[PDB]
């Protein structure tokens, strides 16, 4: 970030990046120019000796389509909050679900990883609307690395009808009232463990419009491990979900088990190779689908950091999914992808 | 605002807010997450000892819907102008209609009020496209507190056809050529009186597409009073309109009588309780409607200012409208609403 | 540009403008309020004493329509690059096609000139998606004033089908693989000559959907001249195209000859009168059209610069086109336009 303002107890940072990015793939919905930029503002005000006020907004602006194209920009984050010394912080708005406090440990690939085809707004697993989040860092300032979070999310319902809210959306991004919690900590120097749990009510449209997934509650359980020392980064996460993992355009998996593992090495001159394996296995799917792989790929790439403001990267998604009636009907890509990027960050 | 640049006669103020907001209501089109942010710039250049140039842009970015939702950001203001000593200022672009010079005195509620009796792009009552505005403060420097404005707005017509302009829109936001004037007198520190007038040609689509309201011209007459001293804020405004006030989706009221009154108290410790009453009465409505209430509510709330950069509020709109064929057919909300907000300001 | 950050080798410049603009014309698709603003950022990081990293984003935000109107903002530019001593620079993203390195010399009118009705995304003639651009200044430092560029653009295909890419668009803005080069030389102080060439594959939809133009490839050849000294600015460019110039909504011209010439004078007190002639003539058009003028007008205007941050202008497009079957079927405006603008710049 770049501090652009600091007067009379208020500071503002401007941050973002411009990513000149191209994908090469046989999947025509992914192949081609993917250039985009992100811009954001982070503010913080000293209210009193212990109390601070803050705000953050992060905007994504696509630059890979024409000036006559639609829906090219969107808000990723927008929240306001208060932090009281070591007692913790509280913020509300569009923010990350606390499941990401642990699953973010494997979200370190040069380009790929993280969100799936539909994106965020997947209960408390990624960026979400209307989350109230309490966080406590370093256990009231006493235990370095021991962090916890408690989160609540209000219902974001249908566009119209009895299940509507003002900010309605399609079944794949709807949610009822929900809660989540996360706890991360260091076992040893450079070694961390983390746990996250979430439970949300599902909506009537989620239980009637798509063909797959039925249940009143969406739940996730995650465990994660991280090694970050001696220029080596190792991370793994395992998540078991119930009615919460999308099965592409078909609905939700009644049960799913997601596993991700990554190994990276940082050379002092800037080069950072990366190798990872990601899989999401769906269980008990309806319509005779039974058990199906939803995601399965090995990732190999590298980022070269010129400095903190400039980098270049390559990433190879080695797609291990077979083409079958599930991947075709769900619209899940089975093709490999190569990404090439040049990034200026502020 | 936050001044981020001030060099070689030019200065730029970056301003905005991030409002973590939630509405509680039985009306499902209102209920839920309402988080949004505003961001703008105010620029000013000293051309010479007597001449200053200026520009302002204000953007609204909703953050309560998904990253794949449409139409989540829009420009509220965008205008450039010149100010010449005591001779006044002139600006053109998207800016407030001069009726708001007086009705803004009651637009001070913690959350509600504002675009209720006179919504956006509603002739010269609120923000408007293509307004050319001449303003004069302290009557050419000769009468302290005496301000006046003269404004002209060119036609903003239909999307296609004989009534079109490049920037066409639907009947509810159209206008023909029009003008407005306002005069406000700050007679003494904290005591003010104001008058505003507007007259616009109506369009052919406004006299055909909506179910209600017919006439060649839209006219408004406003009177206002404001007391702001001794930690107390009192204000009232009365506006009588002809073919200018919207009757929801039904069209325009042939005549309307709009009234707003507010009383607030500012405690030194930061709390600002507020009580208000707002009403808009439609008269001589066609199709058997006769006289109907378009808007009617008591507002009770409070804002707590932590400092100049952070605040929190609660607002309770006690909706006095009843569900009837007019409110149903016009799409006017008759339910109560509670708003809870946490705002970071810059 | 306004430098809002300069610390540790990283520099950020915020730039843009707010243009309070109104057009007066008998053409209802152009007549009326045209207010808009531009905002951008130019960032540069010193990686080492010879290598620099950079990025630029330019955003256009229309402010002439309502807050409920769609598609009012878009990215004009977004690219990241590396610049290394005399070896040159390389950038990738949304950037100008290298034909603009020479045609930009006539794109200096108060308001008119530049892009036509469809706008940019016209092979390498204007702003384009997915362009990889190599530039070299002063021929590796060996020939002062001799610059060149080499550019590649990957396919930007259809929305769906065999010829699709992720960022698909309509035939008017598609392209296959393309290459461009430019070369400019300052013969003497203030006198330059330039040449540019582009060759792009045309897509199957371009060769099947539109009424006019058929060919495997789009090709352009440009020569230009500029005099910029003694407060005088004269420039001209001639471009010959094959299957590259849009014939309005009808398609592309099998052959076209474009010519633009401009003359301006800068008075020390701020006034800058301007006169220009612009023509685009389609040759070998199918369906009995034969030779037709696609664009033909004289431009007379003036800009008054109060200083570097504030200006006002009047521009008069004297449209020499006649209403015929070609202009009617192609949707080409044949009407005169007068533009009046008041601009604040940062
Ligand atoms: C900011 C922390 C708030 C935690 C309150 C959780 C209330 C439980 O809601 C869960 C409903 O899901 C079933
Ligand atoms: C705020 C204080 C509480 C902090 C959170 C406590 C721990 C949250 O529980 C997380 C549950 O994680 C279980 C991990 O299991 C991974 C796979 O589980 C298989 C399903 O049983
Ligand atoms: C650190 C990640 C190393 C990559 C491991 C690849 C393992 C391949 O698994 C294929 C599973 O097929 C069943
Ligand atoms: C500009 C010359 C340097 C560009 C990098 C070399 C290109 C080869 O890339 C191989 C990357 O392999 C990454 C897997 O580890
Ligand atoms: C506009 C003329 C009517 C005068 C009303 C004045 C009311 C309050 O005056 C404030 C004087 O206090 C000193
Ligand atoms: C045409 C209007 O004629 C009505 C005259 O009534 C005068 C009311 O003016 C109100 C000014 O405040
Ligand atoms: C079908 C509805 C009735 C149409 C009658 C048209 C008469 C137009 O009169 C315009 C002038 O009257 C203005 C009256 O304003 C009185 C209130 O002024 C408020 C200022 O504080
Ligand atoms: C020059 C216009 C004078 C203002 C008169 C109209 C103001 C409307 O409010 C009057 C009623 O005051 C109610 C106070 O409670
Ligand atoms: C301070 C005493 C002066 C009172 C001013 C009287 C103004 C008379 O206005 C009549 C028009 O009323 C408009 C509102 O009508 C509502 C019914
Ligand atoms: C002379 C100036 C007097 C100022 C009047 C102050 C008005 C007092 O307002 C009380 C504020 O209390 C806010 C209560 O909001 C409750 C919302 O709760 C929702 C209930 O469902
Ligand atoms: C101060 C703004 C925080 C708003 C919290 C909203 C909680 C959602 O409740 C839904 C029932
Ligand atoms: C010394 C003045 C040069 C700039 C004057 C521009 C106006 C004269 O242009 C005449 C028409 O030329 C059309 C453009 O053709 C350029 C051909 O390129 C040849 C480069 O030597
Ligand atoms: C003030 C009206 C001037 C009209 C434009 C004339 C342009 C003359 O420029 C000639 C430069 O040589
Ligand atoms: C003062 C020199 C500017 C040149 C004006 C050209 C006007 C062209 O008129 C064509 C009308 O038909
Ligand atoms: C170097 C001076 C260029 C000025 C542009 C010419 C303006 C008048 O052109 C009239 C052309 O008429 C063609 C028919
Ligand atoms: C050199 C400046 C030339 O500007 C003249 C513009 O006037 C042309 C005549 O247009 C009349 C219609 O325009 C009405 C609004 O100005
Ligand atoms: Li289930
Ligand atoms: Li595959
Ligand atoms: Li009427
Ligand atoms: Li009610
Ligand atoms: Li051709
Ligand atoms: Li014409």
Author numbering:
A (entry chain C), B (entry chain A), C (entry chain B): 0 to 345
Quote the passages of the study that discuss this structure, keeping the authors' original sentences.
Another important mechanism involves the modification of outer membrane porins which enable the non-selective diffusion of substrates, including both nutrients and antibiotics, into the bacterial cell. A key example is a di-amino acid insertion, Glycine-Aspartate (GD), in the extracellular loop 3 (L3) region of OmpK36 which constricts the pore and restricts entry of carbapenems into the bacterial cell.
To that end we solved the crystal structures of chimeric OmpK36WT with D and TD insertions expressed in E. coli (OmpK36WT+D and OmpK36WT+TD) by X-ray crystallography and compared the minimal pore diameters to those of the previously solved OmpK36WT and OmpK36WT+GD structures. The OmpK36WT+D structure demonstrated the presence of two different L3 conformations, open or closed, both yielded similar minimal pore diameters (2.94 Å (D-open) and 2.95 Å (D-closed)). Notably, OmpK36WT+TD forms a particularly narrow channel with a minimal pore diameter of 1.88 Å. These values represent relative pore reductions of 8% (D) and 41% (TD) compared to OmpK36WT, the latter significantly greater than that imposed by the GD insertion (10%). We found that liposomes with the OmpK36WT+D and OmpK36WT+TD variants had significantly reduced meropenem diffusion compared to OmpK36WT, with rates similar to those observed with OmpK36WT+GD and empty liposomes. All L3 insertions increased the meropenem MIC four-fold from 16mg/L in ompK36WT to 64mg/L (the resistance breakpoint is >8mg/L). However, most isolates (98.8%; 164/166) with the D insertion belonged to a single clade of isolates collected in Thailand between 2016–2018. We also found that L3 insertions have no effect on the diffusion of glucose, a key carbon source that is of lower molecular weight than beta-lactam antibiotics.
